[PDB]
Structure 1
Amino acid sequence: AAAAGPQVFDVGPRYTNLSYIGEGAYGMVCSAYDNLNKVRVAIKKISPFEHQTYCQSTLREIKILLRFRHENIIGINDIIRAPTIEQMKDVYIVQDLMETDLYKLLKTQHLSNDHICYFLYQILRGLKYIHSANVLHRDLKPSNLLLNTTCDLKICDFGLARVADPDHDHTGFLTEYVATRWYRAPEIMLNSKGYTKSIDIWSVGCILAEMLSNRPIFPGKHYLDQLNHILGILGSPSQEDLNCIINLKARNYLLSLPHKNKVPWNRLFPNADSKALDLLDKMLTFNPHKRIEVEQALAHPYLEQYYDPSDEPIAEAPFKFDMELDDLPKEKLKELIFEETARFQP
């Protein structure tokens, strides 16, 4: 069994010429030469079976990525595991090799307006498909946007993804959340479990702002600081928007804060395209009910060079129902993972 910076990285007769590409979630990542297709590919070794949290993110992701087929969403090309559940200690996920991601790119490169527009287009194109499947990604951020050398973009990391559940979105004030702080919508801190599509649009608005300036727009250090960052730019919410918050504790918290006026987008982003800022405004709307939806965003004038609804496909087979993974033990998740990955066995 071949080794890499060991540790074991054994990917069978198909994948050769390994090179260690750092680490990721639950193990090591390498590129490899794929001998069937004669391309280099990315392979993630996943060892999740000791922790039920890792098992859930692994299963969730596999089920979703195997069902989805879209240009702007990373595919699973192959899955390598032992032929029996008993012998299966690890799973290897094979995906297209993408050179970089938007987090790495923004660390050193200024994007032209043309690049911002095309990246945003592809983010929203992929998101349209996801949302059309009744799925929420829930952790959109620059590092989950993979890029190649020709600017093709693909959304990755569906480990926190869920079937949309707007009827069950309500929760109390200061309910703990798992997804990445700087990209969390204000309602997550107030009254929302993040079970509606509007959570993802907020994250895209954060990403757009980050592309415009190469810095995160709302870099909170903790929970209420995240909200204070947001309120620092958007200003105090209107009485109408406060009235939509029925949660007394959340509403009263907002009423306790000193009044803040809106910081104009064109003062924050003086070099930005005006149409970009108009779209940004509509994505970073405080009230999630008033926030633009994915298809409206696609149709916004900023994206008019690319918008073509006939070439912005939707899912054939949406996930109608809640997957019921939260309430399943490690061992059971491992059995489902085995079944889900059977398709790739010779």
Structure 2
Amino acid sequence: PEMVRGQVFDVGPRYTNLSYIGEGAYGMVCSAYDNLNKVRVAIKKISPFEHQTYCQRTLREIKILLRFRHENIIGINDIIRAPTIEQMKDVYIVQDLMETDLYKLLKTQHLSNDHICYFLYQILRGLKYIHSANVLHRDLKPSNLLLNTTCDLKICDFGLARVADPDHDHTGFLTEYVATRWYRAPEIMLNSKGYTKSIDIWSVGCILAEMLSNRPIFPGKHYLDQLNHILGILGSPSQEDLNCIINLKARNYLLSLPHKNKVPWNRLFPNADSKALDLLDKMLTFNPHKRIEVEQALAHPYLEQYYDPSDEPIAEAPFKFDLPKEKLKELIFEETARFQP
């Protein structure tokens, strides 16, 4: 097999001329020349079979991406693995090659208002499709938003996704761990398991803020610090919003804090489009029940140049609804079979 940086990267005769890109959540990522389609592609090596948790995440990533088909979602072009379950040790996922991600872009490039508008439109268009399938992404952040040379945007990494379950969302105080810290909604720390669509809208709001200034809006230094940053900008919650939190530990924590004032968005972002800030406020709303939903966000005046519900498709087949690693390996083998030989 071909080797890269001293490790096996076995993508067979179809894919050649490998180049190392870097390390992602799953391991090594390379580009390669697709000798069939005559174009360069991205390839991700996954090695999950020794651990049940890794197998769970890998099955989610593959099953969801194979069912979805949408312009603003990365999808999967091919999957490479051994012909037998016995010989299968690694799985390689082949995807369209992109130029960059939004994390890298924000480190060095100022975005025009037109680019912010276009990126936000594409994020929400993809998210409408995901939510219409009854699925929560649960880890939206700039590094999971990929861009090609013409600024087409693709949402990636569904390994942390779940089927929505609003009836079973309530839990206790300081127990939950959903999403990446800076993009994590306040209720995750208070009383929520992250099983409702509002979790994703919060993350998109955080991304919009970061596009406006090139800096994360709520840069918590650790898990417990994150709520300090959120409240330092939104200010103290209203009585009505507190009344929506029945859990006493969570409500009493908030009641114990000194008063904090809201910091006006236009003071944080004096060069921003006023319509962008109105939409930002609606996405970064403390009460998840009052927070704007994806279809409302698409219809906001900020996005009027792009909005067209007939060109914002939904999923044909929503997902309506303890396995050992051995059983999960079998499921991964079966899910990837369509790409043999």
Q: Where in structure 2 are there 5+ consecutive unaligned residues?
A: 1-6
* Cα drift, residue 332 of structure 1: 1.2
Residue pair 1:59, 1:333 contacting (<8 A) in 2 also? yes
Deviations 1:320-341 (A, max 9, x none): 01xxxxx222111111100000
Residue pair 2:178, 2:194 contacting (<8 A) in 1 also? no
1:155 aligned onto 2:150:
no
- TM-score, normalised on structure 1? 0.96
* Cα drift, residue 178 of structure 1: 4.2
* Cα drift, residue 49 of structure 1: 0.7
Q: Whole-Å Cα distance in 2 between the matches of residues 150 and 29 of structure 1?
A: 22
Deviations 1:40-67 (A, max 9, x none): 0000011111121211111001000000
Deviations 1:137-182 (A, max 9, x none): 0000000000111110000011110000000111100013042000
Alignment of 1:68-217 (within 5 A): 68-217=68-217
* Cα drift, residue 227 of structure 1: 0.6
Q: Whole-Å Cα distance in 1 between the matches of residues 73 and 204 of structure 2?
A: 15
Q: Percent identity?
A: 100
* Cα drift, residue 27 of structure 1: 2.3
Structure 1 stretches (4+) deviating beyond 3 angstroms?
Answer: none
- TM-score, normalised on structure 2? 0.97
SS in 1 for 2:70: coil
Residue pair 1:25, 1:46 contacting (<8 A) in 2 also? no
Rate the CA distance shift 1:123–1:187 in 2: closer, same or farther, 3 A.
same
Deviations 1:34-91 (A, max 9, x none): 1111110000011111121211111001000000000000010000000110000000
Deviations 1:85-125 (A, max 9, x none): 00000000000001100000000000000000000000000
1:289 aligned onto 2:289:
yes
SS in 2 for 1:79: strand
Q: Whole-Å Cα distance in 1 between the matches of residues 203 and 221 of structure 2?
A: 17
1:334 aligned onto 2:329:
yes
Q: Whole-Å Cα distance in 1 between the matches of residues 298 and 190 of structure 2?
A: 28
* Cα drift, residue 13 of structure 1: 2.1
Moved more, 27-36 or 211-220: 27-36
Deviations 1:200-224 (A, max 9, x none): 0000000000000000000001223
Moved more, 21-30 or 98-107: 21-30
Q: When the two structures are aligned, how many residues end up with a matched partner? A: 335
Deviations 1:251-303 (A, max 9, x none): 00000001001000000000000000000000000000000000000000000
| Residue 229 (structure 2) aligns with | 229
SS in 2 for 1:261: coil
* Cα drift, residue 26 of structure 1: 3.0
